[PDB]
Write a protein that binds this DNA or RNA. Structure first.
Ligand SMILES: Nc1nc2c(ncn2[C@H]2C[C@H](O)[C@@H](COP(=O)(O)OP(=O)(O)OP(=O)(O)O)O2)c(=O)[nH]1
Ligand SMILES: [Mg+2]
Length: 868
DNA sequence: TGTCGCTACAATCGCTAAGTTCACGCAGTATCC
């Protein structure tokens, strides 16, 4: 009678169907000897409200205090007489429950007795501020059905579920293969210790041509790759894709090449040629229904792909739109709005993976557009078709097939990127840790993950969580650097998980720090037991430590090493976001006093460590909120390691959980400012042999907002300055290289790509006020003016500042590289680069350097020293 | 419709206020009527 399946996604409609949640997942059907998508509708999820009784009865209007003690019987009688009649509640089940509370609502005791009352989700929802003569507060009034279900059944991310006494649906309600109806939450249970089942992953790339007549993006091809046995707990398979299907349509007025049909037939691929976008969309929807993928992956899927698909479906009136998801509906949610919420609702039941968002979360790159990711991750070169060539493709079979194969290659690259970063396993792990839904986790962001983690933690410990909500404080202390150049051995000491460790050691929790509704609250007493937040953060820290230890294994595959590093960084960021959400104004658990206490303890710890190290007769030259840089004044590495171990042990002796570890040994350092230095990191190889690795932190050479020419010049200068050559030779080489770069720029021998400068966008180009015209924004608008895919918020834009004879400021002459290559009145402003891109960076680098100054750099670059 | 925290640096733009130059008065000498 039981029903075991692996649930992946959950969907709830607060307005359409009250008290109903649909769970989508995989179920093993023995006859087919494979998993089939199944949907389970958990109905009758009653809403629970906790009422806080008063100590004594109070008159409602007079605001008096009669003095009659208020018991649970009196509370129930009042709710049955006044409130039940007032708000038209017919049936409700009432019981007395002893629950805890420690959050930001005044006059609520830590532990007290409440009258839990439930009733159907069809009944009206009580107001959040409801009060009465016998009760002073009502909680959980705005509790969503999904949250109630997840917290009641203790479901934490994807996992196997067992359903008792399943029912059959009267009529089909989902596009899946198996359906089942659960009459109550209590009939659903969780079964642990079972491997996740392989899922279907569909990677799709589409090419569109915009109609300037209506500024509508019309789809002309969809190249899609599918793998039916993609694992969620193992390494990506090779080859990453099993089979594929291609669909290619024509425009409204253009026609196919002469012998397109014969060439397509000879190609032997699964090419299905749809005459019109309507037939193409119908075929795509039928294919999606047949495959029924569980994880649809793409690039800009949430921003461009799904939005265009749904808009064209609506325009062409493709009958069964709801097949894009897994539920059966008739009315499409209104498009637009912020975020991909419309897209997510449209694709309900399918986990949408946007490798753009995932790449932004996982790695750091100068640009996040597909070509840059392909070059950086896969180390391949991507051929880009200009939109004019896409329009002109309808003139020969060869070019049309080239366009289709380019779409196919883009889809393959998207799948390869998804597999390389290991996005799906990491999403599963983080979802299990947090306990939210996987689609939200893959949508990005840290607030929901930590919020659901703390929801699960507090709920399981008999606590009433706060109702969902419908530089504030000081931070870390940065030591004043001893700016200069150091040629001896510098020993770096860095704390491990400093803020998690502070939370653990000092027992900082909602139930331990007695706040008061900007003074740092008192530390908790050492008598109290460990709180919920220390326990959760300790679990996170232990998981990260386990991953790091697993990384230390010798002879590891470099790809597996990078995957482990990414996972460790993700866990570190998860813990740091758990800390940060305490100081998030819109968070469910906004506890600014707790964050202030944590930061104050961090500052105190750093100050104490600095004082201890200085009291040890050692030199301290830098430190950023958890770290210290020490000038050993030694040239032997063994003594450096010995002293480092001694000082690390001495510092660790004063703490119970906080530990200090030797971060690295720098043979040479260039301390310029706060958060700006370059060093030759030393990694010992053995038998007294060590390898020197360069390391730049915060310099302009490691920033995407500078031209690659300036970055190259600064890198060469830093390499020379950090070398062991005599100073005179270093200065001579710097002069020679600067003269060479000046000659190259003056003679136009530099490659054009070295002039690009990248600046990201915060809002849409339209939403930027008319604050003159910020360079990138300027170019951004041009890109939107031109006939190409628009540029939205959070998109990098590479522009080249060029001469136009305008006698205007540089910031108002920013242009795209294609603009320069096209227009005959635009030329690269050589003087601008030589004076404001190369000179500033090298001058900043060489500030503490003897023999080099701004005037000398200008002279070597061929500029006029006068102004400098 | 959501949206982790804070600290630091750097370029750009607007504002604006001190600093500067250029021009108006007085005194003297001189030339030229
Ligand atoms: N909220 C938040 N806090 C951060 C972030 N990055 C760093 N911090 C805080 C918490 C860290 O413990 C502290 C020191 O930074 P670290 O990069 O050395 O990380 P941490 O010491 O926690 O761990 P680790 O040294 O990598 O083992 O600064 C962040 O992105 N968000
Ligand atoms: Mg650290």
């Amino acid at each position: 009678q039981v029903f075991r399946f692996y649930w992946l996604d959950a969907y709830e409609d607060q307005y359409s169907q009250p008290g109903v949640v649909y769970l989508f997942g995989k179920v093993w059907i023995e006859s087919a000897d494979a998993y089939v998508s199944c949907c389970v509708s958990v109905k009758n999820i009653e809403r629970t409200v906790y009422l806080l009784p008063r100590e004594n009865r109070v008159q409602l209007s007079t605001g008096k205090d009669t003095g009659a003690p208020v018991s649970m019987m009196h509370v129930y009688q009042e709710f049955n007489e006044a409130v039940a009649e007032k708000y038209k509640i017919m049936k409700f089940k009432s019981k007395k429950v002893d629950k805890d509370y420690a959050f930001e609502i005044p006059d609520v005791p830590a532990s007290s007795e409440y009258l839990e009352v439930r009733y159907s989700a069809d009944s009206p929802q009580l107001p959040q501020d409801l009060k009465g003569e016998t009760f002073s507060h009502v909680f959980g009034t705005n509790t969503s059905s999904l949250e109630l279900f997840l917290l009641s059944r203790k479901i934490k991310g994807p996992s196997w579920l067992e359903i008792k006494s399943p029912q059959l649906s009267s009529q089909p309600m989902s596009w899946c293969k198996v359906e089942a109806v659960v009459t109550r939450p209590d009939q659903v249970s969780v079964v642990k210790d079972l491997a996740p089942p392989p899922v279907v992953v569909l990677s799709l790339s589409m090419k569109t041509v915009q109609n300037a007549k209506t500024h509508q993006n019309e789809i002309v091809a969809i190249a899609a790759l599918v793998h039916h046995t993609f694992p969620l707990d193992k390494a990506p398979p090779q080859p990453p894709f099993q089979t594929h299907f291609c669909v290619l349509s024509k425009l409204n007025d253009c026609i196919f090449p002469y012998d397109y049909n014969e060439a397509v037939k000879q190609k032997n691929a699964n090419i299905e040629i749809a005459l019109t976008e309507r037939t193409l969309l119908g075929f795509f929807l039928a294919k999606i229904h047949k495959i029924d993928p569980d994880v649809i992956v793409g690039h800009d899927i949430y921003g461009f792909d799904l939005e265009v698909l749904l808009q064209r479906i609506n325009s062409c009136k493709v009958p069964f739109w709801s097949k894009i998801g897994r539920l059966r509906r008739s009315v499409m949610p209104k498009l637009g709005g912020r975020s991909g919420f419309a897209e997510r609702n449209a694709a309900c039941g399918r986990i949408i993976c946007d490798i753009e968002i995932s790449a932004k979360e996982l790695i750091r790159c100068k640009s996040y557009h597909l070509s840059e990711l392909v070059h950086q991750i896969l180390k391949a070169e991507r051929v880009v078709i200009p939109p004019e060539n896409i329009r002109n493709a309808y003139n020969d079979s060869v070019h049309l097939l080239y366009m289709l194969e380019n779409t196919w290659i883009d889809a393959k690259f998207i799948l390869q990127i998804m597999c390389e970063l290991n996005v799906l396993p990491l999403a599963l792990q983080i979802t299990n840790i947090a306990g939210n839904v996987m689609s939200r986790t893959l949508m990005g962001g840290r607030s929901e993950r930590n919020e659901y983690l703390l929801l699960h933690a507090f709920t399981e410990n008999n606590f009433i969580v706060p109702d969902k909500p419908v530089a504030a404080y000081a931070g870390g202390l940065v030591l004043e650097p001893k700016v200069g150049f150091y040629d001896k051995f510098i020993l770096l000491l860095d704390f491990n998980s400093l803020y998690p460790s502070i939370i653990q050691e000092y027992n900082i929790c909602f139930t331990t720090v007695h706040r008061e509704a900007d003074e740092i609250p008192e530390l908790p007493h050492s008598d109290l037991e460990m709180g919920i937040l220390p326990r959760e953060i300790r679990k996170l820290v232990e998981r990260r430590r386990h991953v790091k230890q697993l990384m230390k294994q010798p002879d590891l595959n470099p790809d597996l090493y990078l995957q482990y590093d990414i996972r460790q960084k993700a866990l570190k960021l998860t813990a740091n976001s758990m800390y940060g959400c305490l100081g998030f104004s819109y968070s469910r658990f906004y506890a600014k006093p707790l964050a202030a206490l944590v930061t104050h303890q961090g500052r105190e710890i750093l100050l104490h460590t600095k004082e201890m190290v200085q009291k040890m007769n050692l030199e301290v030259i830098y430190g950023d909120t958890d770290s210290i840089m020490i000038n050993t004044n030694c040239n032997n590495l063994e003594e450096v390691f010995k002293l480092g171990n001694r000082v690390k042990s001495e510092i660790n002796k004063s703490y119970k959980l906080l530990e200090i570890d030797i971060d690295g040994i720098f043979k040479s350092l260039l301390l310029l400012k706060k958060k700006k230095y370059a060093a030759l990191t030393v990694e010992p190889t053995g038998d007294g042999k060590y390898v020197t690795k360069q390391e730049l932190k915060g310099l302009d050479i490691v920033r995407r907002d500078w031209c690659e020419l300036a970055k190259q010049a600064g890198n060469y200068v830093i390499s020379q300055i950090l070398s062991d050559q005599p100073r005179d030779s270093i200065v001579e080489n710097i002069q020679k290289k600067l003269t060479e770069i000046g000659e190259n720029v003056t003679n136009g021998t530099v490659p054009i790509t070295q002039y690009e400068i990248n600046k990201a966008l915060t809002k849409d180009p339209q939403d930027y006020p008319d604050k003159k015209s910020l360079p990138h924004v300027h170019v951004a608008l041009w890109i939107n003016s031109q006939g190409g895919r628009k540029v939205k918020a959070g998109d990098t834009i590479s522009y080249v500042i060029c001469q136009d004879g305008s006698n205007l400021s540089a910031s108002q002459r920013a242009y795209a590289q294609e603009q320069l290559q096209k227009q005959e009145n635009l030329s690269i402003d050589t003087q601008y680069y030589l004076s404001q891109q190369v000179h500033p960076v090298v001058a900043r680098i060489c500030e503490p350097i003897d023999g080099i100054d701004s005037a000398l750099i200008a002279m070597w670059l061929g500029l006029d020293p006068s102004q400098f």
